[PDB]
């Protein structure tokens, strides 16, 4: 009997379970419950800490995924089935998981939190993609990943009101942060030196959580891959959530005909419904066509975020902090197959000139007719004008620009002529294994399965190649997770990683060659979107 | 005596001179009358053509000079005195040189005709830089140059009255014009084969020559060195050249307070003020600081054009026309150094960025602050958005896109796509000898030195170099002239000059080197000016 997959923490004892890799045995515990179960009249409030528990609760499979739209535009199609739910869909869905090493660590030992992405509206920490063993054997790191609610049920909200306050999901990670700095020292981890990290959504959930007062001091570093928390799609203001929770109420119908419609009245009809009721309405919310935008988001509220993301990015002071920051080479291409006209994931996508002229509505929408023509403007080639194969990758850097690159560069940039110490990288491999066309490049999401060491996995074909470089990231990520640093310690010999500031603006490449330092993170787009297309859309 | 230097045109006799070059000797007819002198109630009126005289008028050394500012800003320099008149001034200047080969041409030979720039203020036939012995000795053709009526005396409009019609500089050309067609026989020249060729203003005014019906008819190929009809700087609406008109009279005491009013009153005074009088105040009627803008210019009257140059080169038929046109490496440079803060001569121009976007508003005048902020995105480096060098270089780019190479793009490829063969270059070769500083590169008119084949004057410190390179330029100039075709008739040694369309935009860089065909005449920045910027002025 192996004593260390039995762990005590302050709601009750848990049984693990060992997870092998070609390296060696971790230990696992999978499913914690971290919060009381929000279902009936709890659905759409802020969690409450979980009671404690008698017993011994089994820690050795993840929980239930939290209720959330699935993708059935490719049944069967790895590339999308990769991120659809691998558990029963539930709203008892608030528990987290804890991969740490064998043998357990003596000496504490730092934290990496994990907050999967999926535009607010879906995701898992039971992904196979982000399996913690391969991480936790090779860098001997504690990580934690918890599931947090998404969609309606984590981000309906009607403003000011009780009932439906908004932000749930958010709070659902502070809640699991909480947790952390409360038990994560029975596992061997470090509760001075929890390091958190999330892609897309969950970059964004990260930056959220530096902005967040009573979240600040959960943790002391920040990983954002691919999001931000001032993206266009990140947030969303108060009107418009309200006009989105009323629009949902009345696509299930409520209220009821006949009766008043104030907040209480219509969570309460909201609340009758089955939760699969709420999911099948959810994309039926959203203005206009558009690729890159959810229903429900973060709402800037005054409470979770006191002030915008934008705002309070410029007014802070973030000294002592270091946060590692990075995108894509092609963020935009995976979106560009969810509405923009002529794209298709099974043909080349040699779009039209009217169909690029057509996806960039798509692509960048509610904005005025002569803002569309500035985008125009800067990503039209005017010496190839209408070459079809141009004009896909032009509308591919529209999308990912407005929507990753730019919101990112410029938190990079504010971060680290504020105080805080910013390292930038640009992931440019593409996996031998993507089931993805070859014309979408690298696309939004495919630089997690090296963070998380998913090619080490002898049951998949990766190259040994992508092996080699998938331990590479992992020592970065462990680095920058123990020091703030990601360069080693021990090593002059290797290339060195410059930090990012707002003059020099040094970024890394990170592919199977040796790193290579660059300048400018897409500056001249990004001083278009950044600078100049905001004083366009004031003077309307 | 020689019987090659006695000619007889429709009007009188004429004496000439023999010009030597290293080549061989040249006869010329310098001073020829093609009107009666502008003087007394002719001012600001059309030319009426030279009465025929008795006896034999002298036709061996130039003319006077029209009245015009003459520049003082720098004394004893050669870079701007060269400009200079080097006659001295009179209201009777129209008169016109003829170069012809010797011994003459027995058969009839093609003609080029060359007007001089100077922005509609300045300029004359007589300067060194267009000594036409070279040309003429060196390829055989026929050259002719006329003077014209440059600032208050040309184009000072008063539109709808009689008094001052306006555009009477343009017709003081079309009259030269119709001399050549009368006249050039004499000299051994063909009158079914004219190509006119001009510079600046010049090239300017050879564009409204083609846009002009009744000037249409007396010439078949235009060459455009620099200069279009349509750049912002060319032409004047009737209202603002009618408040110009009004401010001159007024600086000048026209009318006497108080009596009005009319034009017919405003003009009579007008004519009493002594010609230097005009102008030593022709600057100070210009709406704002600026640079490149000038006080007295073509007007849109509805006569001479009926209608803009822009509209008029969208809606006309260019089929059996041959068109040569091109501009120098650094277009804007010459003109940051009289207005734009920061600027000198005499020392390198390391501007500051406050100094930059102050010149911006120099380099663009009368233009929204969001036009400005439009114009900075576009011309800053945003990796080194305070790189001194790099901020001079962006206002010469400024100055020298906006006023000349994207007018003169724009106006090559409707042409082209409108029937019209068109020929493209970019001059890139930087004098020996020139006096301006090197951060200039090669300035606005120093190519015309080369194509009248300066560089043979034996009295000049030029480089064997730049005598083979000044050949090869005649012969190109020449061959466009003979043929509508610079490439060699045969010779296919020599790498080929291919036309200029408006999809592939190829041109030919022009330096000591051999051709080298490029693409896109600045494609990128030329989309800002005459795409998008307009549609940014509409909604203000
Ligand atoms: O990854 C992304 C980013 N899009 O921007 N979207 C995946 C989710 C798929 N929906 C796209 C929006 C339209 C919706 C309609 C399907 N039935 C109702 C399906
Ligand atoms: O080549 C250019 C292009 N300028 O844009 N200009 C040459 C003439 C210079 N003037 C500048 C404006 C000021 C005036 C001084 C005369 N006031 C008394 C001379």
């Given at each position: 009997e192996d004593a260390e997959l039995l762990v005590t923490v302050r709601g009750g004892r848990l049984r693990g379970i060992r997870l092998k890799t070609p390296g060696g045995p971790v230990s696992a515990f999978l499913g914690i419950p971290f919060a009381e179960p929000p279902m009936g009249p709890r659905r759409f409030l802020p969690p409450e800490p979980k009671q404690p528990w008698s017993g011994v609760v089994d820690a050795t499979t993840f929980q239930s995924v939290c209720y959330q739209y699935v993708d059935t535009l490719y049944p069967g199609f790895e590339g999308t089935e990769m991120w659809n739910p691998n558990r029963e869909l539930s709203e008892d869905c608030l528990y987290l998981n804890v991969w740490t090493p064998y043998p357990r660590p003596t000496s504490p030992t730092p934290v990496l939190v994990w907050i999967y992405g999926g535009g607010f509206y879906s995701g898992a920490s039971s992904l196979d993609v982000y399996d913690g063993r391969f991480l936790v054997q090779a860098e001997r790191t504690v990580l934690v990943s918890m599931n947090y609610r998404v969609g309606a049920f984590g981000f309906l909200a009607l403003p000011g009101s009780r009932e439906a306050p908004g932000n749930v999901g958010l709070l659902d990670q502070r809640l699991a942060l909480q947790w952390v700095q409360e038990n994560v020292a029975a596992f061997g981890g470090d509760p001075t030196s929890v390091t958190l990290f999330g892609e897309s959504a969950g970059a964004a959930s990260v930056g959220m959580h530096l902005l967040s007062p009573p979240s600040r001091?959960?943790?002391h570093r920040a990983v954002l891959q691919?999001?931000?928390?001032?993206?266009?799609?990140?947030t969303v203001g108060m009107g418009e959530a309200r006009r989105r929770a009323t629009q949902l109420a009345h696509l299930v119908?409520?209220?009821?005909?006949?009766t008043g419609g104030n907040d209480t009245e219509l969570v309460a009809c909201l609340r009758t419904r089955p939760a699969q009721v709420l999911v099948n309405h959810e994309?039926?919310?959203?203005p206009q066509e558009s690729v890159f935008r959810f229903s429900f988001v973060p709402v800037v509220d005054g409470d979770f975020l006191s002030d915008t993301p934008e705002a309070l990015i410029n007014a802070g002071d973030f000294h002592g902090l270091q946060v590692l920051v990075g995108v894509v080479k092609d963020e935009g291409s995976y979106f560009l197959v969810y509405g923009a006209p002529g794209f298709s994931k099974d043909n080349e996508s040699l779009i039209s000139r009217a169909e690029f002229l057509a996806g960039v509505r798509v692509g960048v929408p509610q904005v005025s007719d002569l803002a569309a023509e500035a985008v125009v403007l800067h990503y039209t080639?005017?010496?190839?004008?209408?070459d079809p194969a141009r004009l896909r990758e032009a509308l591919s850097d529209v999308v990912g620009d407005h929507n990753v690159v730019c919101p990112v560069a410029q938190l990079a940039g504010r971060l680290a002529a504020q105080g805080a110490r910013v390292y930038a990288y640009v992931f440019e491999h593409r996996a031998?294994?993507?089931?993805?066309?070859?014309?979408?490049?690298?696309?939004?999401?495919?630089?997690i399965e090296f963070i998380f060491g998913i090619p080490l996995d002898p049951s998949r074909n990766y190259t040994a190649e992508e092996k080699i470089f998938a331990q590479r990231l992992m020592r970065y990520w462990a680095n920058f997770a123990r020091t703030g640093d990601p360069n080693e310690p021990r090593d002059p010999k290797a290339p060195q990683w410059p930090p990012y500031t707002a003059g020099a603006q040094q970024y890394v490449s990170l592919d199977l060659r040796p790193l290579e330092v660059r300048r400018g993170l897409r500056a001249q787009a990004c001083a278009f979107w950044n600078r100049f297309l905001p004083k366009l859309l004031s003077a309307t």
């Open positions: 001091g959960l943790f691919s999001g931000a928390p001032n993206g266009p799609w990140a119908g409520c209220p009821p005909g006949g994309w039926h919310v959203l080639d005017w010496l190839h004008p209408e031998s294994t993507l089931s993805w066309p070859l014309w979408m490049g690298v696309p939004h999401g495919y630089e």
